[PDB]
Amino acid sequence: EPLYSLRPEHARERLQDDSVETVTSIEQAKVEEKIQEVFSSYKFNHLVPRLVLQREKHFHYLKRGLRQLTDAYECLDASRPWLCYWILHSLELLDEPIPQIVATDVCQFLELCQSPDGGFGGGPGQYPHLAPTYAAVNALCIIGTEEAYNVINREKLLQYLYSLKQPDGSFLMHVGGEVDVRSAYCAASVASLTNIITPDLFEGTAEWIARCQNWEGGIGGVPGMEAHGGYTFCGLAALVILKKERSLNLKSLLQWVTSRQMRFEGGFQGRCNKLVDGCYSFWQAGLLPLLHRALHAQGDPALSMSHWMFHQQALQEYILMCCQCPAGGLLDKPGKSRDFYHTCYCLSGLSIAQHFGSGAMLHDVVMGVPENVLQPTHPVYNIGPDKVIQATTHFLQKPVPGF
Amino acid sequence: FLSLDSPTYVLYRDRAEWADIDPVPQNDGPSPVVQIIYSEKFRDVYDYFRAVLQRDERSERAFKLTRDAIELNAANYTVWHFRRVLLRSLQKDLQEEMNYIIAIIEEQPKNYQVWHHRRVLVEWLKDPSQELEFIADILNQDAKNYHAWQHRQWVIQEFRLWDNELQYVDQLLKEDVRNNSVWNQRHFVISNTTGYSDRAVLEREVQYTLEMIKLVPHNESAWNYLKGILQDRGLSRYPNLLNQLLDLQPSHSSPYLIAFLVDIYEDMLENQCDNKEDILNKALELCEILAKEKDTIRKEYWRYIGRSLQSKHSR
Ligand SMILES: CCN(CC)C(=O)Oc1ccc(C[C@@H]2CN(Cc3cncn3C)c3ccc(C#N)cc3CN2S(=O)(=O)c2ccc(OC)cc2)cc1
Ligand SMILES: CC(C)=CCC/C(C)=C/CC/C(C)=C/COP(=O)(O)OP(=O)(O)O
Ligand SMILES: [Zn+2]
């Protein structure tokens, strides 16, 4: 009883290296040693385990970062809209309101980032790129006012997306950039939310994405490349937006993700024979809701009506025990430093693991104190489902540009 | 020329060669958000980069400035784009630029911009001759670097350099048989050369994997490879496979072996196999062995597999 990771038999889930040591096994055993110490610390210190999400610490870390960042974030100077999205999403998940004037200041900042030729860049005067375009549009939707919606130039945005579209179905990340399954997701996310999808915008795109699924079951960044959770999320989520989820072998995909949850740590790895992280609480585990909605759309009557097809409890235990910084913020794994990215995706993953939804059926699992329960997140867009519905509704008022 | 970590580095604002140009400070608004408190050095380089960018100054001094800007934030895609404009306008020698990107990737190997720049150089030069060896040096430091594998695949495909790659694979597999990137490269090489729809290759591949599985039974990579190359023909098409796995249980058992058994049974049942309602119970016995005892992190998947099989292969 009652925390899965502290049960005596859990010790049997440690790595079996068959007496054959390689780089891979040495590195996995190091991680498992650190994590076991975390799991054990309660017993060694003779205290009852109590899992608490340090909301107030996280809130103050976020509140501050929304305004000001140390020079440690110099590496993210071409990604400032990412920071707006990470932090705003984290606040939304923690159920912390956004002052009308931080809202207006974010709006103004993102307008400075918008390019006269469409899309958003990483900061004022930077050229546009699909990653900061995605982040900007998501941030604006989280804010959700008429001001925030009005920032986006839908006409230019559509021009920009066409400028990136390739003959084989793919998109460039930016002009003169290269192509990637990330770009298809960024394009489909922004297009669908703002209602600018034309009949030919995504012609070939599902087939290009389907070419990225490999012998493993997952999706690589381009055809031929190793399966990875980041790319598998982008690929599946884009196909859900395009209604082409059917193009994939969903069954090999399901077997692949589920295989990515670590038996000992409880969190997810990004690819096979690599390390648990942190942000894959969202990128890997967020596949399960998408696979549920897909397999259900095909009439799969073996589907649970209460749980996603991963160990929700073990993931919550990983995040809560191993991924919180005491000063606020969340992280990849013990011994790493906090950051706003892991704060975003660790909390997004926590939320997914807490909330099951499937039409009529709703069911929560909240490990630790009941205060730990977060607001839900939409598995396709990773903003609140209310922000999505809301946003999709307001831009349906307008015609797809051209019309 | 003047390195950013030279003891004698001077800010651009104190350089005489730059006096004619007024820096352009970042326009962040009256009340900024996510405002990063840049070091003096970063802010100084970038104020001058904005100036040359806005004037579209296509000069040797601008070219050298992009170097410092890149070093300060190599993720800055706007600087890389301008550097490429400058490489072309100034007619810079691209082999020297190849020397530069080599040094940069070597320092910051997990960055998209850096590998994309290299690829652009190789396509400008139509010259892949340094690539496999350079890539092998990066992989000697991190054998799982995703960009390095992606660039390798690209070079091999584009310039048809397939002939020595399976040998490279073999080397790395011996170094670390758990390296999933190397198992993936194996599949990539074989399926683009001889293919797997061939009996001589399909076999040797299987015998090699079973041989790897035997040496280290809890390496999931070899198991996923094995499954991967047999499964789209259908596992039940190979009837000896069952037996040969149902023979190393007490010797080499794992949740991987047991789960492979379930995949075999699953395909058997999907085709109208012999002893139908019979092989089904074997599978369920295993599923619940997995969901309750042997692989409980997947309890929700294995209970769902128990179900769907029940649902379509029972009564
Ligand atoms: C476009 C979708 N969004 C929403 C804005 C998004 O965040 O997507 C990603 C953008 C970039 C990335 C790649 C990296 C990932 N990392 C490094 C990392 C994460 N987990 C383990 N590691 C080693 C990080 C890490 C920290 C932060 C913060 N804050 C951000 C990233 C985002 N990027 S990164 O290439 O920009 C980067 C940044 C800092 C860094 O030094 C730690 C290493 C990489 C992944 C997802
Ligand atoms: C829309 C968008 C931009 C989505 C992001 C997609 C995403 C998370 C991509 C990851 C790319 C990748 C192979 C990282 C490997 O890093 P690593 O080798 O350090 O880590 P790993 O060992 O966990 O693979
Ligand atoms: Zn991470």
> Domain containing A83 — which CATH number?
1.50.10.20
Parallel, antiparallel, or unpaired: how do β-strands A355-358 and A68-69 relate?
A: unpaired
Contact residues for A242 (Cβ-Cβ < 8 A; gap 6+): A188, A202, A205, A206
Phi-psi region of A382 (alpha: psi -120 to 50; beta: other; left: phi over 0): left
Binding residues of A for (2E,6E)-farnesyl diphosphate: 228-231, 271-274, 280-283
Q: Cα A28 to the chain's mean position, in Å?
A: 24
- The answer to whether the CB of A274 falls within 8 A of the CB of A23 is no
Which residues of A fall within a CB distance of 8 Å from B180? Answer: 226, 271-274
Q: Please indicate whether residue A82, judged by its CB atom, sits closer than 6 Å to ligand 1.
A: yes
What resolution in angstrom units was achieved for this structure? 2.2
* Torsion angles phi and psi, residue A121, rounded to 5: -95, 180
Vertex B73 angle, CA B68 and B78, to 5°: 90
- The answer to whether the CB of B228 falls within 8 A of the CB of B198 is no
The token pair that represents A270 in the structure block:
């990004």
The token pair that represents B272 in the structure block:
């109208």
SS3 A368: coil
Q: How many Å lie between the alpha carbon of A224 and the closest alpha carbon of chain B?
A: 6
- The answer to whether the CB of A173 falls within 8 A of the CB of A129 is yes
* Count: domains in chain A: 1
- List gaps in chain B by the residue before each (C–N > 2.5 Å): none
Q: Supply the DSSP symbol for A356.
A: E
Touching check for A62 and chain B: CB below 8 Å? no
Give A249 Cα–ligand 1 centroid separation in angstroms. Answer: 29
Q: With a CB-CB cutoff of 8 Å, which residues 112-151 of chain A face chain B?
A: 112, 121-127, 129
Strand positions, DSSP E, A260-400: 355-358, 361-364
Q: How many Å lie between the alpha carbon of B17 and the closest alpha carbon of chain A?
A: 25
Give B39 Cα–ligand 3 centroid separation in angstroms. Answer: 26
Touching check for A292 and chain B: CB below 8 Å? no
| Ligand 2 pocket residues where CB is under 6 Å | A 131, 182, 185-186, 228, 230-231, 234, 270-271, 274, 277, 283; B 110, 146
What count of CB pairs under 8 Å joins A to B? 207
- The answer to whether the CB of B271 falls within 8 A of the CB of B236 is yes
- Residue A50 buriedness (CB in 10 A; 0-12 / 13-18 / 19+): exposed
Way it was determined: X-ray
- State the DSSP H helix or E strand holding residue B2, giving kind and residue range, or none if neither: none
Give the integer Cα–Cα distance in Å for A283 and A345.
8
Give the integer Cα–Cα distance in Å for A169 and A183.
11
Closest CA to A216 of A258, A262, A168, A244: A258
* Torsion angles phi and psi, residue A114, rounded to 5: -65, 140
CB pair distance less than 8 Å for B176 and A24: yes
Touching check for B184 and chain A: CB below 8 Å? yes
Give the integer Cα–Cα distance in Å for A348 and A359.
21
Q: Supply the DSSP symbol for B290.
A: I
Give the integer Cα–Cα distance in Å for B215 and B207.
12
CB pair distance less than 8 Å for B29 and A108: yes
CB pair distance less than 8 Å for B34 and A109: yes
Give the integer Cα–Cα distance in Å for A62 and A87.
6
Touching check for B124 and chain A: CB below 8 Å? no
Touching check for B159 and chain A: CB below 8 Å? no
Give the integer Cα–Cα distance in Å for A337 and A73.
13
Binding residues of A: 228-231, 271-274, 277, 279-283, 342
Give the integer Cα–Cα distance in Å for A229 and A215.
15
Closest Cα to atom 26, ligand 1: which residue? A341
Q: Please indicate whether residue A341, judged by its CB atom, sits closer than 6 Å to ligand 1.
A: yes
Closest CA to A228 of B107, B145, B151: B145
Give the integer Cα–Cα distance in Å for A231 and A182.
6
Which residues of B fall within a CB distance of 8 Å from A215? Answer: 184, 187, 224-225, 228-229
Indicate the domain borders of chain B. Answer: 1-315
Q: How many Å lie between the alpha carbon of A403 and the closest alpha carbon of chain B?
A: 33
CB pair distance less than 8 Å for B150 and A225: yes
From the list B75, B143, B181, the residue facing A78 with the nearest CB is B75
Q: Tell me the angle at which helices A80-93 and A55-65 cross, rounded to the nearest 10 degrees.
A: 150
Contact residues for A189 (Cβ-Cβ < 8 A; gap 6+): A134, A137, A138, A237, A238, A241, A380, A381
Taken as a whole, chain B contains a residue count of 315
Q: Tell me the angle at which helices B220-230 and B255-270 cross, rounded to the nearest 10 degrees.
A: 10
Give the integer Cα–Cα distance in Å for B91 and A35.
54
The token pair that represents A220 in the structure block:
């690589």
Q: Supply the DSSP symbol for A230.
A: H
Residue span of the structural domain in which A79 resides? 1-403
- The answer to whether the CB of A401 falls within 8 A of the CB of A155 is yes
- Largest Cα span, chain A: 69
Task: Report the CATH architecture of B1-315.
Answer: Alpha Horseshoe (1.25)
Alpha helices in A114-228 (DSSP H): 130-143, 146-151, 154-164, 181-193, 205-212
- The answer to whether the CB of B48 falls within 8 A of the CB of B20 is no
The token pair that represents A325 in the structure block:
């910084």
